[PDB]
């Protein structure tokens, strides 16, 4: 589904853009932002490519931005 029912916990959509208009960084990549959310570390969290996901159980699926002046941001995903 491309939308969320609650907070997007089981959201396995293809949205890869933050609500700020920045393309999300690939989870499997550490450039330019280094993180500890390795797809192999959390394979049950659907950390595929650079799609916005919810690994910490936040209220909105987020992702890392591709800008050095922005660590991470939330993604504007619709609700079902």
């Amino acid at each position: 589904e491309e939308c969320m029912h609650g907070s997007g916990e089981n959201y396995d959509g293809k949205i890869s853009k933050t609500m700020s208009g920045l393309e999300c960084q690939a989870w499997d990549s550490q450039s330019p932002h280094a993180h500890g959310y390795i797809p192999s570390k959390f394979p049950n969290k659907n950390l595929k490519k650079n799609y916005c996901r919810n690994p910490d159980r936040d209220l909105r699926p987020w992702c890392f931005t591709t800008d050095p002046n922005k660590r991470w941001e939330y993604c504007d995903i619709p609700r079902c």
Partner: protein, 57 residues
Amino acid sequence: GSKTIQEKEQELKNLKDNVELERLKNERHDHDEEAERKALEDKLADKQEHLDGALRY
């Protein structure tokens, strides 16, 4: 083998159970500064550069 310490763990910690506890409180997500304190046992003696984690920054 009680003496032979095998690498394979006997008990596997469940990550889902940790989520249910909510001990993280989204803190590790809000600020990664707490991770640095876990990585380094002690703080630097001189002025730490710190800076941001980037390729050109």
